[PDB]
Amino acid sequence: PETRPNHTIYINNLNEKIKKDELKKSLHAIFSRFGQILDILVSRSLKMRGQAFVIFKEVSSATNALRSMQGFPFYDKPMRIQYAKTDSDIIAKMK
RNA sequence: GGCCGGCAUGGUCCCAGCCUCCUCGCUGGCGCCGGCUGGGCAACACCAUUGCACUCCGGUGGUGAAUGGGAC
Ligand SMILES: [Mg+2]
């Protein structure tokens, strides 16, 4: 069962060999155009490696971002995107 | 990274080179053999991982390393 639209896009199948700092930057480099970005969260832990949460300020941005970049080659691997299953705290602390 | 034993080995500097998970270099180290033992995944490598978070957090490996020339 797919997910409902969200301010945060969840991406996976990301090249795990990239360090956290560089990955956040490289990601912001290709997604900042779809709209303001509140934050990007990356973890290289066993459970969270290869994944990232790009938190957009406006749902439309995430939505665009989702349709446009789906499957985009990044660090030699086809990005896989979805909407986050739930709101990120940064969002809750507001709407 | 640290430690011990055995054997071998004239000396002190100089230049160049090379070595390394553990005070990366010129007031580290760069004969041979055997064994004892600590830290840490930070980097690098390999294994495993396709994983939905907002709590930092998988594992194993490396020193089982590296030479020549010159001056007294
Ligand atoms: Mg690791």
XYZ file of all heavy atoms in Angstrom, chain A residues 26-66:
320
model
N 25.358 17.004 -1.740
C 25.043 16.580 -3.096
C 23.546 16.485 -3.309
O 23.055 16.748 -4.410
C 25.659 15.215 -3.389
O 27.062 15.293 -3.476
N 22.813 16.095 -2.269
C 21.370 15.962 -2.403
C 20.744 17.326 -2.512
O 19.894 17.575 -3.367
C 20.776 15.215 -1.208
C 20.837 13.687 -1.329
C 20.624 13.017 0.020
C 19.822 13.244 -2.326
N 21.163 18.219 -1.638
C 20.623 19.554 -1.663
C 20.891 20.222 -3.008
O 20.129 21.080 -3.471
C 21.252 20.389 -0.566
C 20.661 21.746 -0.477
N 19.583 22.026 0.333
C 20.909 22.872 -1.188
C 19.188 23.271 0.114
N 19.975 23.806 -0.803
N 21.987 19.810 -3.631
C 22.394 20.377 -4.895
C 21.383 20.081 -5.994
O 21.114 20.939 -6.837
C 23.784 19.863 -5.280
N 20.799 18.892 -5.988
C 19.846 18.567 -7.032
C 18.382 18.724 -6.672
O 17.532 18.712 -7.561
C 20.062 17.146 -7.553
C 19.925 16.151 -6.413
C 21.434 17.031 -8.183
C 20.282 14.745 -6.811
N 18.072 18.892 -5.391
C 16.678 19.039 -4.969
C 16.245 20.458 -4.575
O 15.064 20.768 -4.607
C 16.381 18.089 -3.809
C 16.194 16.668 -4.224
C 17.112 15.694 -3.854
C 15.104 16.299 -4.995
C 16.942 14.359 -4.253
C 14.924 14.974 -5.400
C 15.849 14.000 -5.027
N 17.187 21.318 -4.213
C 16.840 22.676 -3.799
C 15.973 23.439 -4.801
O 15.300 24.402 -4.428
C 18.110 23.485 -3.521
O 18.877 23.589 -4.701
N 15.984 23.018 -6.060
C 15.191 23.695 -7.089
C 13.673 23.484 -6.985
O 12.884 24.362 -7.342
C 15.614 23.238 -8.477
C 15.201 21.814 -8.784
C 14.851 21.662 -10.250
N 15.498 20.485 -10.813
C 14.932 19.680 -11.698
N 13.706 19.937 -12.114
N 15.587 18.617 -12.150
N 13.276 22.305 -6.525
C 11.878 21.972 -6.387
C 11.205 22.744 -5.286
O 9.989 22.648 -5.126
C 11.734 20.487 -6.129
C 12.206 19.653 -7.256
C 13.440 19.014 -7.194
C 11.444 19.533 -8.410
C 13.910 18.261 -8.271
C 11.904 18.789 -9.485
C 13.142 18.150 -9.418
N 11.983 23.504 -4.524
C 11.409 24.282 -3.438
C 12.294 24.343 -2.204
O 13.242 23.561 -2.088
N 11.986 25.265 -1.286
C 12.767 25.412 -0.065
C 12.916 24.068 0.617
O 12.045 23.211 0.519
C 12.104 26.372 0.908
C 13.081 27.006 1.885
C 12.395 27.778 3.024
O 11.319 28.368 2.844
N 13.027 27.788 4.199
N 14.042 23.874 1.285
C 14.288 22.631 2.003
C 14.541 22.940 3.481
O 15.454 23.700 3.837
C 15.508 21.850 1.434
C 15.217 21.375 0.002
C 15.808 20.670 2.336
C 16.370 20.655 -0.689
N 13.724 22.364 4.349
C 13.913 22.611 5.762
C 15.140 21.860 6.272
O 15.907 22.393 7.075
C 12.667 22.200 6.544
C 11.421 23.024 6.232
C 10.281 22.542 7.115
C 11.709 24.504 6.449
N 15.346 20.636 5.798
C 16.495 19.887 6.259
C 16.576 18.574 5.515
O 15.627 18.187 4.856
C 16.382 19.636 7.769
C 17.727 19.325 8.410
O 18.727 19.313 7.669
O 17.805 19.096 9.642
N 17.726 17.917 5.585
C 17.913 16.627 4.944
C 18.543 15.769 6.018
O 19.498 16.186 6.671
C 18.859 16.698 3.741
C 18.352 17.735 2.740
C 18.941 15.325 3.066
C 19.057 17.685 1.390
N 18.003 14.578 6.224
C 18.526 13.719 7.259
C 19.091 12.440 6.691
O 18.406 11.700 5.991
C 17.431 13.415 8.279
C 17.189 14.462 9.370
C 17.202 15.869 8.785
C 15.859 14.166 10.057
N 20.354 12.188 7.000
C 21.037 11.002 6.535
C 21.749 10.334 7.701
O 22.297 11.010 8.569
C 22.076 11.363 5.458
C 23.182 10.301 5.387
C 21.384 11.501 4.104
N 21.713 9.004 7.714
C 22.371 8.197 8.727
C 23.024 7.013 8.014
O 22.450 6.435 7.093
C 21.378 7.702 9.760
O 22.029 6.840 10.678
N 24.227 6.660 8.445
C 24.975 5.591 7.814
C 24.937 4.331 8.643
O 25.702 3.374 8.408
C 26.417 6.040 7.614
C 26.560 7.241 6.719
C 27.409 6.880 5.525
N 28.835 6.859 5.842
C 29.775 6.298 5.085
N 29.482 5.683 3.949
N 31.033 6.375 5.468
N 24.044 4.333 9.624
C 23.889 3.180 10.494
C 23.357 1.994 9.705
O 22.823 2.135 8.604
C 22.926 3.514 11.618
O 21.647 3.813 11.088
N 23.491 0.818 10.285
C 23.034 -0.398 9.635
C 21.602 -0.305 9.141
O 21.299 -0.752 8.047
C 23.145 -1.581 10.599
C 22.576 -2.905 10.088
C 23.346 -3.355 8.855
C 22.651 -3.948 11.192
N 20.738 0.290 9.953
C 19.317 0.397 9.642
C 18.935 1.563 8.719
O 17.983 1.481 7.941
C 18.563 0.504 10.972
C 17.066 0.357 10.896
C 16.395 0.747 12.208
C 14.875 0.690 12.063
N 14.176 1.360 13.195
N 19.695 2.647 8.791
C 19.380 3.825 8.004
C 20.291 4.203 6.843
O 20.058 5.227 6.188
C 19.252 5.003 8.956
C 18.086 4.862 9.917
S 16.519 4.621 9.045
C 15.883 3.358 10.041
N 21.315 3.391 6.584
C 22.240 3.670 5.496
C 21.562 3.503 4.132
O 20.646 2.698 3.967
C 23.460 2.754 5.582
C 23.253 1.348 5.043
C 24.471 0.502 5.311
N 24.889 0.712 6.686
C 25.943 0.148 7.253
N 26.723 -0.702 6.574
N 26.236 0.477 8.496
N 22.022 4.278 3.155
C 21.453 4.210 1.813
C 20.154 4.991 1.680
O 19.610 5.098 0.585
N 19.675 5.560 2.781
C 18.419 6.290 2.762
C 18.587 7.723 3.225
O 19.526 8.045 3.957
C 17.408 5.613 3.695
C 17.320 4.104 3.571
C 17.104 3.446 4.918
O 16.150 3.753 5.609
N 18.003 2.545 5.299
N 17.651 8.575 2.826
C 17.684 9.960 3.228
C 16.266 10.506 3.270
O 15.385 10.003 2.589
C 18.534 10.770 2.260
N 16.052 11.527 4.087
C 14.758 12.146 4.193
C 14.910 13.605 3.813
O 15.487 14.378 4.570
C 14.237 12.081 5.626
C 13.819 10.708 6.078
C 14.744 9.824 6.610
C 12.475 10.323 6.021
C 14.338 8.587 7.092
C 12.064 9.086 6.499
C 13.001 8.218 7.036
N 14.420 13.996 2.644
C 14.509 15.392 2.246
C 13.223 16.070 2.714
O 12.133 15.784 2.218
C 14.636 15.531 0.728
C 14.893 16.982 0.355
C 15.751 14.650 0.234
N 13.352 16.964 3.678
C 12.196 17.648 4.209
C 11.896 18.997 3.569
O 12.540 20.003 3.902
C 12.348 17.866 5.717
C 12.701 16.535 6.390
C 11.050 18.475 6.286
C 13.001 16.663 7.875
N 10.897 19.009 2.679
C 10.457 20.228 1.978
C 9.454 21.057 2.786
O 8.637 20.517 3.524
C 9.821 19.863 0.647
C 10.800 19.428 -0.390
C 10.999 18.072 -0.644
C 11.525 20.373 -1.123
C 11.901 17.658 -1.618
C 12.434 19.970 -2.105
C 12.623 18.607 -2.352
N 9.514 22.374 2.632
C 8.617 23.257 3.360
C 7.188 23.149 2.852
O 6.240 23.194 3.644
C 9.087 24.704 3.240
C 8.320 25.684 4.104
C 8.953 27.046 3.971
C 8.496 28.009 5.045
N 9.271 29.286 4.938
N 7.039 23.013 1.532
C 5.722 22.887 0.915
C 5.529 21.593 0.143
O 6.286 21.274 -0.767
C 5.455 24.075 0.006
C 5.356 25.364 0.775
C 4.921 26.513 -0.100
O 4.537 26.255 -1.269
O 4.958 27.670 0.384
N 4.487 20.864 0.523
C 4.143 19.589 -0.087
C 4.286 19.565 -1.610
O 4.810 18.598 -2.182
C 2.695 19.178 0.275
C 2.419 17.782 -0.232
C 2.487 19.238 1.778
N 3.822 20.621 -2.273
C 3.917 20.654 -3.726
C 5.351 20.389 -4.188
O 5.571 19.605 -5.122
C 3.397 21.992 -4.280
O 4.047 23.110 -3.712
N 6.314 21.027 -3.514
C 7.727 20.872 -3.824
C 8.083 19.401 -3.725
O 8.590 18.828 -4.671
C 8.577 21.675 -2.844
O 8.462 23.069 -3.075
N 7.809 18.782 -2.585
C 8.100 17.361 -2.428
C 7.476 16.587 -3.595
O 8.162 15.817 -4.283
C 7.542 16.844 -1.104
N 6.175 16.800 -3.814
C 5.450 16.132 -4.899
C 6.176 16.249 -6.247
O 6.397 15.241 -6.931
C 4.028 16.705 -5.056
O 3.302 16.508 -3.843
C 3.297 16.005 -6.187
N 6.536 17.476 -6.626
C 7.248 17.701 -7.884
C 8.505 16.854 -7.829
O 8.689 15.924 -8.625
C 7.626 19.171 -8.018
C 6.423 20.086 -7.917
O 6.519 21.213 -7.400
N 5.277 19.613 -8.416
N 9.347 17.184 -6.854
C 10.594 16.488 -6.606
C 10.414 14.987 -6.785
O 11.230 14.318 -7.418
C 11.056 16.778 -5.201
N 9.340 14.456 -6.226
C 9.094 13.031 -6.332
C 8.889 12.561 -7.767
O 9.506 11.587 -8.204
C 7.894 12.643 -5.464
C 7.384 11.194 -5.449
C 8.482 10.181 -5.669
C 6.735 10.959 -4.112
